[PDB]
């Protein structure tokens, strides 16, 4: 009669590493490193993302003609841009504090596209119809941004603007505008009166005076001039004012928004599909709960810590050594 | 005759966790996590903090009329602000590089209020008695900042201002000033009989020209204009020159200071007491030698690292089981 | 022992045996479950103690903010190097600790048998016992359970030790 003291073995081929020995085969192991993903972009925290497709963020927030078909959700957890994201701005220029604006419109708890200054009421003394350019035609028609309008002289007259907005909404309001920089003085006079123009924009916290910078620029698109873009947040109950005698591009639409916990922007060509996850990566949604992954490290959400290892496995069995 | 070997047990109630077992009983344990504090703010590294009580950094360093009751410390380790520290830039405007000023002033080994431009002799061609406003009156009467003088026209004229200072101190001198931005051109003409005006300030490192931006802003504290604030550090042996034709708010006092690279700014309503500590948190001074704390993520001085753990008792004793 | 048992249907540890009533692996279910509970607590401590927070990794910077972009990259690379080194080192150390734990568990069952049999069996040297007693299924079941009435069996063990 024999009594043998030993341990279980199986046909498992999963191995683990130790400080004293590598490639140790074990009967069971638990993988701490996720190397698989959904391959799809999905909802984060139960809320769908805002997918811009071919449009850039500047394009969407400015209402670029190529973004007319892009429906805006009342809320989103993050923004998705494609690898060919283009048609952001059209009249070329420097979008001021663009990265900060992209950071602010990351995760938004509420987002309503609100009309701040109706086209046919707010500017009875200026022409809101001829403000178009060939930089962004719509079906070749020479169009312009949908959220902003470019005012020009009516009858060789450009009276001073004193339009303001009282922000009677209960949420912060994002107001966008820009400054036009004609190629030469002749274009400043052709487009606007009061060639020695100025623009003033401000709120209780923010105020700044702008001047046109008239000079011939390198050609971009087909117009040797520039359009600088600005934005500001208006606190609930605060008043935002716009004053100008010349090169002011005024908002027509503005966005009333309540911001959520900080999120970010995913650059990816992967299509968007319906799923429910807690962290979304540009390469695809992560479905795991493990502490580490080897998936591309600019993820958004409650994601595990990126590790460059090809495998992380903890042993939970015994040496699988038959004999 | 029987002898036995065993191990110590006692009436201990302190428990520990392990990777293999949870809630084990230990005869004695050393708590590595500090969860207690004095509940009072105290001296850091043997030097008392500057306690502002009610004042903001802008208020104290500019000399807000409601901030005159604070003492002037020769040195401080850190600065304490209350949650009600709204007494700051009483005349609305953009304080330029305000966060940098707060960082620079967070820890000073030697600090003195020095009169840089004597009130009765430095501006014989300008009116230094007016310039009091309703934005921050004192005892119901119009007043202005203690450390700044808002110069206005002597009477139907604003003579050219050109005043330099040579830094004869052995320490760096912090010089503050501001620029006034009237609401309308009538306000500019009333205060400064110069119409278009400019301000120039410079040192051996700093050189900048300012131009008034006249425009109507939203009304804040009954004011329609704005006053921007500027500052610079003059190295010993250098000089600062203030050249202006109007819209310049000139210093009266400047601060001689020897800067450290230590503490930060604590915003807390905790009272100040006398203690010998090395670490200060908004909730109170910490007296501990332990490697970890769960008291507050915002820490000043040579303190343990903040963790989210609620229990890190080290099982320094023996397993305590009855028999 | 020479190696593990590929013919055992369950458990991690056991008492493979052969006697006049047959043979089998007789898995040790109580010590296996105790090992399972402690290893389960270990893996859950490694996984669940990661206090992953909701945060966004990656920031957009302009062409005149290169030092900040390099600071962000420095932070991401430093955290990646710390988490890669600590995660990989933790895996190797924890696996050495886990396999040493399991080997000590087999040693613990062997030691249990040694204390229970009290020289009523001899050691072969590869983790096995050769019984002096003709040890039937009830005998072995009692040994597996941890109960062994040494003084009634010791008379036969003594005679068999005299015989060798």
């Amino acid at each position: 009669d024999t009594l043998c003291i030993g341990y279980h073995a199986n046909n498992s081929t999963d191995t683990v590493d130790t400080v004293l020995e590598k490639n140790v085969t074990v009967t069971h192991s638990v993988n701490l490193l996720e190397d698989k993903h959904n391959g799809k972009l999905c909802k984060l925290r139960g809320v769908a993302p805002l997918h811009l497709g071919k449009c850039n963020i500047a394009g969407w927030i400015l209402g670029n003609p190529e973004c007319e078909s892009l429906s805006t959700a009342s809320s989103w957890s993050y923004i998705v841009e494609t690898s060919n994201s283009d048609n952001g701005t059209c009249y070329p220029g420097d979008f001021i504090n663009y990265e900060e604006l992209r950071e602010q419109l990351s995760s938004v708890s509420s987002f309503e596209r609100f009309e701040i200054f109706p086209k046919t009421s707010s500017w009875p003394n200026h022409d809101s119809n001829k403000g178009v350019t060939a930089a962004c035609p719509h079906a070749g028609a020479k169009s312009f941004y949908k959220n902003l309008i470019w005012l020009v002289k009516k009858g060789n007259s450009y009276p001073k603007l004193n339009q303001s907005y009282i922000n009677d909404k209960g949420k912060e309001v994002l107001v966008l505008w820009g400054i036009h920089h004609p190629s030469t003085t002749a274009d400043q006079q052709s487009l606007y009166q009061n060639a020695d123009a100025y623009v003033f924009v401000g709120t209780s916290r923010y105020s700044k005076k702008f001047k046109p910078e008239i000079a011939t620029r390198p050609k971009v698109r087909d117009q040797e001039g520039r359009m600088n873009y600005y934005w500001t947040l208006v606190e609930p109950g605060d008043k935002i004012t716009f004053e100008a005698t010349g090169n002011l591009v005024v908002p027509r639409y503005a966005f009333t928004m309540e911001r959520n916990a900080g999120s970010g922007i995913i650059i990816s060509d992967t299509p968007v599909h319906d799923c429910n996850t807690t962290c979304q990566t540009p390469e695809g949604a992560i479905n795991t709960s493990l502490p580490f992954q080897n998936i591309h490290p600019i993820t958004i959400g409650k994601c595990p810590k990126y590790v460059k290892s090809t495998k992380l496995r903890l042993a939970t069995g015994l040496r699988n050594v038959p004999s | 005759d029987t002898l036995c070997i065993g191990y110590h047990a006692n009436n201990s109630t302190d428990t520990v966790d392990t990777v293999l077992e949870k809630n084990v009983t230990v005869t004695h344990s050393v708590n590595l996590l500090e969860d207690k504090h004095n509940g009072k703010l105290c001296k850091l590294r043997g030097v008392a903090p500057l306690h502002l009580g009610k004042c903001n950094i802008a208020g104290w360093i500019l000399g807000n009329p409601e901030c005159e009751s604070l003492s002037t410390a020769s040195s401080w380790s850190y600065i304490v602000e209350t949650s009600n520290s709204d007494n700051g830039t009483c005349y609305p405007g953009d304080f330029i590089n305000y966060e940098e000023l707060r960082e620079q002033l967070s820890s000073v080994s030697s600090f003195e209020r020095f009169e840089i431009f004597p009130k009765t002799s430095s501006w014989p061609n300008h009116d230094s008695n007016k310039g009091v406003t309703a934005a921050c009156p004192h005892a119901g009467a119009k007043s202005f900042y203690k450390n700044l003088i808002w110069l206005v026209k002597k009477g139907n004229s604003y003579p050219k201002l050109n005043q330099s200072y040579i830094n004869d101190k052995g320490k760096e001198v912090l010089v503050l000033w501001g620029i006034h931005h009237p609401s309308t051109t009538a306000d500019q003409q009333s205060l400064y009989q110069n119409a278009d005006a400019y301000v120039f300030v410079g040192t051996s490192r700093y050189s900048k020209k300012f131009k008034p931006e006249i425009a109507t802003r939203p009304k804040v504290r009954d004011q329609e204009g704005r006053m921007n604030y500027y500052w610079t550090l003059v190295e010993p042996g250098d000089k600062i020159t203030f050249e202006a034709t109007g819209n310049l708010v000139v210093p009266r006092y400047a601060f001689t200071m020897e800067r450290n690279a230590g503490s930060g700014i604590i915003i807390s309503d905790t009272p100040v007491h006398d203690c010998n500590t090395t670490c200060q948190t908004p909730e109170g001074a910490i007296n501990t030698s332990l490697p970890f704390q769960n008291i507050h993520p915002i820490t000043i001085g040579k303190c343990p690292k903040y963790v989210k753990s609620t229990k890190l008792r080290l099982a320094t004793g023996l397993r305590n089981v009855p028999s | 022992i020479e190696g593990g048992w590929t013919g055992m249907v369950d458990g991690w540890y056991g008492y493979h045996h052969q006697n006049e009533q047959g043979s089998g692996y007789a898995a040790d279910l109580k010590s296996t479950q105790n090992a399972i509970d402690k290893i389960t607590n270990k893996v859950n401590s490694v996984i669940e103690k990661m206090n992953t927070q909701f945060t966004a990794v990656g920031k957009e910077f302009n062409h005149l903010e290169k030092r900040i972009e390099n600071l962000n990259k420095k932070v991401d690379d430093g955290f990646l190097d710390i988490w890669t080194y600590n995660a990989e080192l933790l895996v190797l150390l924890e696996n050495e600790r886990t396999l040493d734990y399991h080997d000590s568990n087999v040693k613990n069952l062997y030691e249990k048998v040694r204390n229970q049999l009290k020289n009523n069996a001899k050691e072969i040297g590869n983790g096995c016992f050769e019984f002096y007693h003709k040890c039937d299924n009830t005998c072995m079941e009692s040994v597996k359970n941890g109960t062994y009435d040494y003084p009634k069996y010791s008379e036969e063990a003594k005679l068999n030790r005299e015989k060798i």
Partner: antibody, heavy 126, light 107 residues
């Protein structure tokens, strides 16, 4: 899936009772059986625990000494015994599946109870 | 083990949404909280395990989340079949389970 309980038992105050529950589509040796008492003022009271692997049990702290349990693979039943009862112990005594008991638990499903039984009642009111 | 169901009674019509808050005295890991439904006349059925995971075979109408000492069960629509009683379950490392008392559900 769906454990089997049948034949309600009615006895007398001050006398022992026996309860049973049979496994459905399982191997029996990968889980335990836990009982929950349903009564007008208790709601759900965790009574009993067993593991069909080790034979170990945590009874219940306030009832130790009044309940005995042992497994029997041959007929697949919990085979509960209850003795020294009064009359306040009348309850449904639902049967449920407990811990995995045999593999590392990486899924919270193996702590939560599921696949409750049919709820055969016991009445001791005579 | 202390489990408290705060609202006591929830009386809401079908088509609305409601929550049940279960407070624990001891902070525990999320792995040990489960939510159950008890329709009178039948046996309890599992709704949620691990404080968030969906039970096998249940519609998306039932959800929940929680942490620390405060866990919430969220019921959407509140169909006639939902007006029963809910129990909060807690496990604490050792093989010890408890249930709460639940709340009354009324139209």
């Amino acid at each position: 899936v769906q454990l089997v309980q049948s034949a309600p038992e009615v006895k007398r105050p001050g006398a022992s009772v026996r309860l049973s529950c049979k496994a459905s589509g399982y191997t029996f040796n990968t889980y335990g059986i836990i009982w929950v008492r349903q009564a007008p003022g208790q709601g759900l009271e965790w009574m009993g625990w067993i593991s069909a692997y080790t034979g170990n049990t945590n009874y219940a702290q306030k009832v130790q000494g009044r309940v005995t349990m042992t497994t029997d693979i041959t007929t697949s039943t919990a085979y509960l015994e209850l003795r020294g009862l009064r009359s306040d112990d009348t309850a449904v005594y639902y049967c449920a599946r407990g811990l995995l008991q045999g593999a590392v638990i990486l899924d919270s499903y193996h702590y939560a109870l599921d696949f409750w039984g049919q709820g055969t009642t016991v009445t001791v009111s005579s | 083990i202390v489990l408290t169901q705060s609202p006591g009674t929830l009386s809401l019509s079908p088509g609305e949404r409601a929550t049940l808050s279960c407070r624990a005295s001891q902070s525990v890991t999320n792995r040990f909280i489960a939510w159950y439904q008890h329709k009178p006349g039948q046996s309890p059925r599992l709704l949620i395990y691990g404080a968030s995971s969906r039970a096998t075979g249940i519609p998306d109408r039932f959800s929940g989340r929680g942490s620390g000492t405060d866990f919430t069960l969220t019921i959407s629509r509140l169909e006639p079949e939902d007006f029963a009683v809910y129990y909060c379950q807690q496990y604490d490392t050792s093989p010890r389970w408890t249930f709460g008392q639940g709340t009354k559900l009324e139209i």
